[PDB]
Ligand binder design. Structure first.
Ligand code: K
Ligand code: K
Length: 327
DNA sequence: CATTAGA
DNA sequence: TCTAATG
């Protein structure tokens, strides 16, 4: 957590690089298990050699550990950090809709900057255009105070359209968080669950609503179960318009809401942890259900859930307000 | 780890 | 169809 710190950081620096700038999925995957394993290790690595005894720790990496231990740096890292191409790649990547694969390509064509991409809007797809369009706004955090204004609007139309809907804004928003990165609305309806052959409209009606009143302003991608957009709070009585915000709405079979909600509410740890416990408690939990364990090794058979409680009850735990689902 | 775009 | 990009 801090004793193996630099080593793990150096290493991830390294991994991240192969994966992006290079297409070394392997080396990339290499640096990762290593950083992983050096990370668990309970002692101060004092040398490659010592490290080296670890699993995943080969000669390539150990060598790296010595240099880093030896001097407070590493050339390779110094070199990559300098590297205009790689730099270029790292940056393009901040554009929404630009993964590495596109970053490389663009670079190749020589589009290394924001300005570049503008001049070349034509080489970009809708998602990418939008992302470009909102590069600043997308990068900016969402203050809760705003999160409260968006949530408010959202539940309102949802309800106007059909009173049968159930919506929930998940994420750190749900867990307290002073600000968030984007809004995640989990949607469902009684008339749609596991079997009941869809109702693509169910997603549609809603988006259409939000659009109709100018809450939604663009669509990144819209499918029958997952819509991915951009929204904006009504710019007041002037002098202050709101930043463009990413939103995602997703339909869910009512018979799997709460686990979904559960899950998506996080946190990553509270989850893993509550999850590990259902194992003892004789269960299995995942983004959609909760099944009882069967001695033979594994088992099936989804228990029925009507609320975040049911899941709790089942693993015979203390109901945890989202607020403190921190871990 | 599953859903969407796009070519 | 595959492959990229999100989350
Ligand atoms: K080893
Ligand atoms: K990106």
């Amino acid at each position: 957590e801090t004793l193996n710190g630099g080593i793990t950081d150096m290493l991830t620096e390294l991994a991240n690089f192969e994966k992006n700038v290079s297409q070394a999925i392997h080396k990339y995957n290499a640096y990762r298990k290593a950083a992983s394993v050096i990370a668990k290790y309970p002692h101060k690595i004092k040398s490659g050699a010592e490290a080296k005894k670890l699993p995943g720790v080969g000669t390539k990496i150990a060598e790296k550990i010595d240099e880093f231990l030896a001097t407070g740096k590493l050339r390779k890292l110094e070199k990559i950090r300098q590297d205009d191409t790689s730099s270029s790649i790292n940056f393009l990547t901040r554009v929404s809709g630009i993964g590495p694969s596109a970053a490389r390509k663009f670079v190749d064509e020589g589009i290394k900057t924001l300005e570049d991409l503008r001049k070349n809007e034509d080489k970009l797809n809708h998602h990418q255009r939008i992302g470009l369009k909102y590069f600043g706004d997308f990068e900016k955090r969402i203050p809760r105070e705003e999160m409260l204004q968006m949530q408010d609007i959202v539940l309102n139309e949802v309800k106007k359209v059909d009173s049968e809907y159930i919506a929930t804004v998940c994420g750190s928003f749900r867990r307290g968080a002073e600000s968030s990165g984007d809004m995640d609305v989990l949607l469902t309806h009684p008339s749609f669950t596991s079997e009941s052959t869809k109702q693509p409209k169910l997603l549609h009606q809603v988006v259409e609503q939000l659009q109709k009143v100018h809450f939604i302003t663009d669509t990144l991608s819209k499918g029958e179960t997952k819509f991915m957009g951009v929204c904006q709070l009504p710019s007041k009585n002037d002098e202050k318009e709101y930043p463009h915000r990413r939103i995602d709405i997703r339909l869910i079979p009512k018979d799997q809401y709460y686990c979904g909600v559960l899950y998506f509410t996080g946190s990553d740890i509270f989850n893993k942890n509550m999850r590990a416990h259902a194992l003892e408690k004789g269960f299995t939990i995942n983004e959609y259900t909760i099944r009882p364990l069967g001695v033979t090794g594994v088992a099936g058979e989804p228990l029925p859930v009507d609320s975040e409680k049911d899941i709790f009850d089942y693993i015979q735990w203390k109901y945890r307000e989202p607020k403190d689902r921190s871990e």
